[PDB]
């Protein structure tokens, strides 16, 4: 569960950083 | 080969094993209780985190 | 840059993160500009689409709402290549969602040109994908006022026979849908071609597709009578069953006397589906047919059916109960009841079920004395399954038919059930006893039942004592604590001294059960002494159960 | 420590009542508890007045459910199962698991006896091994259940005057003292008194005979009559061989055979039967047919 949560959070923040670009 | 000295050494060593083993059991038990407590707390924190994240997504 | 991160998230190993990326294409759409969206994501969602079939479908679904973020109609062409590459997929539902998104997104001249292009793509596929792209191009040209009228007609005619049994079945089954968006002249020519294909339907699934096309024609398309005659000729076992499938829709519409005749004929394995459809046909007839034209066909079908099948007979009886008053219906009901007396148990089941509609027709209280004998002999047969079903039906008809009507005789039946051997029968008896008391009030209860069971509380077979215990357990719920503490409680406390340990720990169970019903003072005065006394027993089970009763209430 | 595993067992039984088996670890702990319970039972067990005797079951679990539906639920009705639980049926594992779970939970309300098909050899041949493997991908279950079968009491004695046992009786056995003086903690030997109790069967030819089955003998009437008289029994009940009526009265009301597995031999298509010993030791039989599939 922790691994899944960390993975989805990383993907979300990656998309947010893409928005930043 | 059965004999009283052997039996006594057997009971002594075996009782010692049972006691040290129950001790290791108790220490590992408390360890696992605290471990799952911490991991459940981390799951709850990540839940509040995902809630805040969807809130910010709706906000932005 | 956005296309790149889309590919990377689509290159993710986990199906869940990728599925999130799928659910998050709107994020990239809002990121880019609508012009940049159309210019970039459309080539991307056209070329670079490779994932799980479920994820491909999810992409198609997320695309189904992309007729706006591209720029509207003036760019529908730019949306057509990808759907084409998604209309040629091997999985049926994926290209089906593709056709749905095409019809959703389809200035429609570019969509029409690309629809002729999708018809060209269908020319390559020699399977149901041809019919899929054809149905797509149909609506895509209809968005441009069906400019591809001759093209749509030719596509339907080619799907009528294109060495593609899949696409041929699709055409011969849903020409009414694929040629619906096509031009009226194109639709009529495709209807002629569909009649030709249904005549050309040779296999069994071909016969089912032909029956479906004939039903769609008789629904939407003397021409009606001519098509109906062709369908009836095609309908008179495998092909006969596939045609009986739509025989009900044929009779569900003078325009049906031939259909009702065919239904009464084919049913007299094809007969099984025939009578299945004849259930709905009889419903529609009794609801719509004219009494003059009814009488003859009704009597013929009644004589035929009275000779699964019983289920259709009961359905037709309940439907024809829509007649105001028919002595012939009374004769049919009497015959069916005498049948259910000596036949499969399902006969009696369906008969007592439709007894509601029977009483709705005239009032089953009249015919009561007619059905009563059957009832009693259905309550005393060998196979305990039958007696069980009869018990299950008993409270419905009892509370349906007043107290005194049953209290004369049927009370003896409830008793005979309570004393029976087969445990399931006793259980059903107690449950329906609770239903009866709920419907007939505690006055009738205390006057009629409770004395009888409390008398039953003493007899050799300890099963025939625990049954009284269970009756008490289930009566306490509704009989109200007054009558309980007046009559039930004394007997329970007394049975608490039975020799058999089973009786004793069931006493404990029932005491724990009816505890909350009772008064706290009554509890502490009466039952707690008995409870601890039981806990002082030697049987470990009765000890455990008494301890449970204590810790659940005391 | 006590009510907790009781609740666990109740949950197990409830799960089992839906053809839903247990995990091999659950089966392991269950068989351990059942060994602990069975070790306190003589080779000839005594059961109080009211019971319900049922015989050959043979893994027909849905028919066992039908049985329970006929004769009452588990704790309410006292049962007595005379062996042959697991083979020639698909739900062997579920059947034996349920019966053992009951015996562990209500150790006083139910009693299970050893049977011909409780030896490792016969199971390995006739199928219980195959279902153990299919449903578990192991033999650990089939090991546990056999090491448990090696403890089941051989016989039961209801109200000191009804003798219940799978199979029949043997020449090396003259009185219940003899049976009670055996060693039942072993696998069924190929020849002995055990290989006859669980293998013999009555017949017409008086005196002993040769069993066409290959093990045990075929005790005639006189054998049973003298056995009853010399032991004070009023009736010997058994269940080892198919009886299409459901229950047969062999040797002039001295021996009863009660098959309790319906539609066992499909060419015959028998109906199962069980016997009820009421509060006054009066027997009354219930014949039932296979459940509706
Ligand atoms: Mn057997």
UniProtKB/Swiss-Prot annotation, chain A:
It is found in: Cytoplasm; Membrane. It comes from the Eukaryota. Belongs to the WD repeat striatin family. Calmodulin-binding scaffolding protein which is the center of the striatin-interacting phosphatase and kinase (STRIPAK) complexes. STRIPAK complexes have critical roles in protein (de)phosphorylation and are regulators of multiple signaling pathways including Hippo, MAPK, nuclear receptor and cytoskeleton remodeling. Different types of STRIPAK complexes are involved in a variety of biological processes such as cell growth, differentiation, apoptosis, metabolism and immune regulation. Tetramerizes. Part of the core of STRIPAK complexes composed of PP2A catalytic and scaffolding subunits, the striatins (PP2A regulatory subunits), the striatin-associated proteins MOB4, STRIP1 and STRIP2, PDCD10 and members of the STE20 kinases, such as STK24 and STK26. The STRIPAK complex can be extended by adapter proteins such as SLMAP:SIKE1 or CTTNBP2NL. Interacts with CDC42BPB. This is Striatin-3. The chain holds residues 103 to 123 of 797 of the full protein.
From Swiss-Prot, chain B:
Residues 16-60 form a coiled coil. It is found in: Cytoplasm; Membrane. Signal peptide: none annotated. It comes from the Eukaryota. Residues 10-18 are annotated as: Caveolin-binding. Belongs to the WD repeat striatin family. Tetramerizes. Part of the core of STRIPAK complexes composed of PP2A catalytic and scaffolding subunits, the striatins (PP2A regulatory subunits), the striatin-associated proteins MOB4, STRIP1 and STRIP2, PDCD10 and members of the STE20 kinases, such as STK24 and STK26. The STRIPAK complex can be extended by adapter proteins such as SLMAP:SIKE1 or CTTNBP2NL. Interacts with CDC42BPB. Calmodulin-binding scaffolding protein which is the center of the striatin-interacting phosphatase and kinase (STRIPAK) complexes. STRIPAK complexes have critical roles in protein (de)phosphorylation and are regulators of multiple signaling pathways including Hippo, MAPK, nuclear receptor and cytoskeleton remodeling. Different types of STRIPAK complexes are involved in a variety of biological processes such as cell growth, differentiation, apoptosis, metabolism and immune regulation. This is Striatin-3. It comes from Homo sapiens (Human). The chain holds residues 62 to 121 of 797 of the full protein.
From Swiss-Prot, chain C:
Residues 1-366 are annotated as: PP2A subunit B binding. Residues 37-293 are annotated as: Polyoma small and medium T antigens Binding. The modification N6-acetyllysine is found at residue 256. PROSITE patterns: HEAT_REPEAT (PS50077). It is linked to Houge-Janssens syndrome 2: An autosomal dominant disorder characterized by global developmental delay, hypotonia, variably impaired intellectual development, poor speech, and dysmorphic facial features. Some patients may develop seizures. It comes from the Eukaryota. Changing residue 465 to L: In HJS2; likely pathogenic; disrupts interaction with PPP2R5D and PPP2CA. It is found in: Cytoplasm; Nucleus; Chromosome; Chromosome, Centromere. InterPro entries: ARM-like (IPR011989), ARM-type_fold (IPR016024), HEAT (IPR000357), HEAT_type_2 (IPR021133), PP2A/SF3B1-like_HEAT (IPR054573), PP2A_Regulatory_Subunit_A (IPR051023). Changing residue 166 to T: In HJS2; likely pathogenic; disrupts interaction with PPP2R5D and impairs interaction with PPP2CA. Each HEAT repeat appears to consist of two alpha helices joined by a hydrophilic region, the intrarepeat loop. The repeat units may be arranged laterally to form a rod-like structure. Residues 75-222 are annotated as: SV40 small T antigen binding. GO terms for biological process: chromosome segregation; female meiotic nuclear division; intracellular signal transduction; meiotic sister chromatid cohesion, centromeric; meiotic spindle elongation; mitotic sister chromatid separation; negative regulation of hippo signaling; negative regulation of phosphatidylinositol 3-kinase/protein kinase B signal transduction. Belongs to the phosphatase 2A regulatory subunit A family.
UniProtKB/Swiss-Prot annotation, chain D:
Mn(2+) 2 binds at residues 84, 116, 166, 240. Its EC number is 3.1.3.16. Changing residue 222 to H: In HJS3; decreased phosphatase activity in an in vitro assay; no effect on C-terminal methylation; no effect on the interaction with PP2A subunit A PPP2R1A/PPP2R1B; no effect on interaction with PP2A subunit B components. Fe(3+) binds at residues 84, 116, 166, 240. Mn(2+) 1 binds at residues 56, 58, 84. It comes from the Eukaryota. It comes from Homo sapiens (Human). CDD domains: MPP_PP2A_PP4_PP6 (cd07415). Catalytic subunit of protein phosphatase 2A (PP2A), a serine/threonine phosphatase involved in the regulation of a wide variety of enzymes, signal transduction pathways, and cellular events. PP2A is the major phosphatase for microtubule-associated proteins (MAPs). PP2A can modulate the activity of phosphorylase B kinase casein kinase 2, mitogen-stimulated S6 kinase, and MAP-2 kinase. Cooperates with SGO2 to protect centromeric cohesin from separase-mediated cleavage in oocytes specifically during meiosis I. Zn(2+) binds at residues 56, 58, 84. The gene is PPP2CA. One of its GO terms (cellular component) is chromosome, centromeric region. It is linked to Houge-Janssens syndrome 3: An autosomal dominant neurodevelopmental disorder characterized by global developmental delay with onset in infancy and additional variable features including hypotonia, epilepsy, brain abnormalities such as ventriculomegaly and a small corpus callosum, and autism spectrum disorder. SMART domains: PP2Ac (SM00156). The active site is at residue 117.
